[model samples]
Target: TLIVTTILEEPYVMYRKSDKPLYGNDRFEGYCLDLLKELSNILGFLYDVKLVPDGKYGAQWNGMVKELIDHRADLAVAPLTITYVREKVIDFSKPFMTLGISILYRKGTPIDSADDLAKQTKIEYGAVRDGSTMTFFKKSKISTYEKMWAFMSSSALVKNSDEGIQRVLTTDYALLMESTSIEYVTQRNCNLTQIGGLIDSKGYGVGTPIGSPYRDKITIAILQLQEEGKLHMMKEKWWRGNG
Candidate 1:
């Protein structure tokens, strides 16, 4: 059995509601879980899902990336975004979903752009520490984003997206979140709204250890599923109303 490392993220991966004790894969459900089943069917392998202990994803290998680099996991199948640096360390399958960074805030906000946030101080904004959005600002050379990066100094950074969303609701704060996540959260929370267009475009992909045999196999399966419109179908299944 292949050890698959992932994280608990809404619409991507989450604990299933059950009074009875659930074991192994039955304990969880979401887009990634469904995707894993499809991949398994096509590629013929068994997988065991393990949540990353640290629940972070960046720098010198921590979280799921670390799980793969250290060979603790044969694959990483979560809402793991594909990036140049991450690609250098792990092999990512063809993108299953495309996304980008955007602003998450409570509804009825005056702000409409990242520049608007950069131009003000009363409304604080930040992203999850070491996440792709945070990394984008940290490494950005653009003057507008550079200004934002300056303001985001550790004081504004949150430990995770849930924490960042809580900050947005309880205070004058805006959290930078991936647009796909924005879609899911805004749909579920009527009080929450997405501000600004995408900051930059990226995609989420399945990750495998470098030189792993399953990389190409998984990529082909993804392409087949995408061709059959199964990727979109899976997203629709998981992202719909919880009721």
Candidate 2:
């Protein structure tokens, strides 16, 4: 059976009722979960699901890949992004979805884009998780006309996406987040708006343990699923609007 790892991010993947720990069939039920199911069916494999805590996300996932390299789990189906560093250790399926960094601000805020934020010396911009796409903006070379001081101090970093959004809703702080996540916050809180454009577009893919025999099979399954309606359906379910 394949062992998948995923984080608790809303819309993309989150507990419908987080108060209780989920397991079995209920464990795999979000957009990622649904995608996992369809892909597994297409690939003709049965699997088990596990909920990993935030602290162990990276370690556990990488460890699982190592185990697979040593012939343990057959594959992994987390919302793993395709990156150069990870490519060194594991193989990723063709990108199933694409997303980008976005800004979240309070309603009635005069901010239009990065330029607007850069114009104010005192404006504090915050990021979600440190290693996420949001944090990538810290040194992003936007047009020289729109450079921000977000990376000037560690104080600009918020605890997580929720905290970053809360800071913007309850105070003057603005949040940098993934487009998919920003869509979630906007749907839940009308006061928040995700700036229309994106900072960068990155691809999200499934990661298989390095040298696993299942890698090609999984990649083919992903391509087929993408051609089918499953991928688009999952995106629509989570994004709150048409792609």
Candidate 3:
């Protein structure tokens, strides 16, 4: 059986009823959940899914790799990026999806671009899930503001995107989050606006313990699913409105 871990995010993954402890249906359902079922059929494996906090993802990911090297879990599936540092410890399948960074603000905010925010010293900004691409903006500037304070000096730093958006809706804080997440929030009419466009784009892939026998099979299965239009269908079903 495969032990897969994922972070909770809306329209991709989230807990609908806190007490029920079951994933929801509709566009807000787990994106990886639907993909996992089709993948299991193609690769011939049973799976057990679990949620892990984002803060521990790095440590858990490395630990899983060690277990794979030691012959523990069979495989892992998540929206993990293929990076050189991670490749040293584990093997990753071909990219299954692509995503980028986006900024969200309350409706009627006079700011039009990053430059506008750069000019203001009093404005408070927030980012979801520290260590994300949001750092790119925080470190780089057009002119007015310094990199550190752009983020560090924010009136608040929310741990989740939803909280960051709530900060915007309830207060004046602005949020930097994922493009898919911002789309998911906006589609629900959350009284938020996405400013500018994607700051950076990156590919997401599945991870496997290094040298697992299932690596090629899982990669091929993902490609085959994409070839048959199942991947596209799932994306549309989850991200597109009225699916």
Candidate 4:
């Protein structure tokens, strides 16, 4: 059996609403759940999926990724964005989905761009640690925010996106997070809105233990799905709420 580590995120991974009974792999449902089933069909393997125990995804060798690097897990499946930092440890398969950093704020917030926040002294912005929104600024190549470090210092760097998203509903706060999540939240909260455009376009990929035999196999399966239009079908089915 393959032990796959993942993150709990909406539309991508959701807990099943059940009062009766469910065990192990049956307790959760979402895009990854369906994707994993298709992948397992192709790879001919039984798999067990679990969330990252530490509630973090980052560059730390001892963090959530340590298990994969230490051969404690067979792979990872989530909205784990592909970045140079993450690639140094885990081998990410082909990107199956796309996302980018977005600015989430209160309705009628007077903000135009990230630079707009930078240009003003009356407001401040923050990001959830270990996510693409923060990764964008810290990236070594063509970083989006030159004043990111400065801006974050003056703002509250939260541990989760909900904290940052919630922080924006009241005062002059803006939250940096994946555009997809922002879109999902904005639709649910009338007071919330997205400002400007996405910071940088990126994708979420399947991850495997470094040099594991599963990486190439998973990549081929993902590419085949892409060729046959199954990937888009999956996204539209889950991400777009057909389910």
lDDT of candidates 1 onward, in order: 0.89, 0.68, 0.67, 0.79
Which pairs clash inside model 1?
none
Worst 10 residues of 1 by lDDT: 234-243
Each candidate structure's TM-score, on Cα atoms with residue i matched to residue i, is 0.85, 0.81, 0.74, 0.81
Evaluated at residue 124, the lDDT of candidate 1 is: 90
Better of 1 and 3 by lDDT: 1
Task: Report lDDT (Cα) of residue 171, candidate 1.
Answer: 92
- What are the C-alpha RMSDs, in order, of all predicted structures? 2.7, 3.6, 4.5, 3.3
Per-residue C-alpha lDDT of model 4 across residues 85-198, encoded as one tens digit per residue: 788988999898877887888877567787787676667687887665675676625433767556675445778877787688766788888888887787668777888898
The most accurate candidate by TM-score is: 1
Tens digits of lDDT, candidate 2, 1-243: 666665565565666667677667575457878888887788777776654433233432444445444545455555566777667777888888877877888778667887777667566886755555544655666662225534434377777777877788787777777777777778777777876478777777777777667778878888888888778978777767432
Candidate 2 wrongly placed segments (more than 4 Å)? 15-23, 53-55, 59-72, 132-135, 144-146, 150-154, 241-243
Clashing pairs in 2: none
Error at 180, model 2, angstroms = 1.7
Whichever of 1 and 2 has more lDDT, that candidate is 1
Q: In candidate 4, which residue ranges exceed 4 Å CA deviation?
A: 108-110, 129-144, 147-156, 241-243
Choose 1 or 4, whichever is better by lDDT: 1
- What's the distance in Å from true for residue 18, model 2? 9.9
Q: Would you list the rank order by TM-score, best first?
A: 1, 2, 4, 3
User: In candidate 3, what are the lDDT values of residues 91-196, reduced to their tens digit?
Assistant: 8888888777767887676888766665665667757545564556566654433553454555367777667878888777777766777777776664777877
User: Which pairs in model 3 have colliding backbones?
Assistant: none
Clashes of each: 0, 0, 0, 0
lDDT of 1 by residue, 1-243 (tens): 999999888878888998888888879998999999999999999989998999966456798998999999999998788888899999999999987999998888778889999998888999999876898899999988999999997379999998998998899899998888887888788888889888998888999999999999999999999999999999888766552
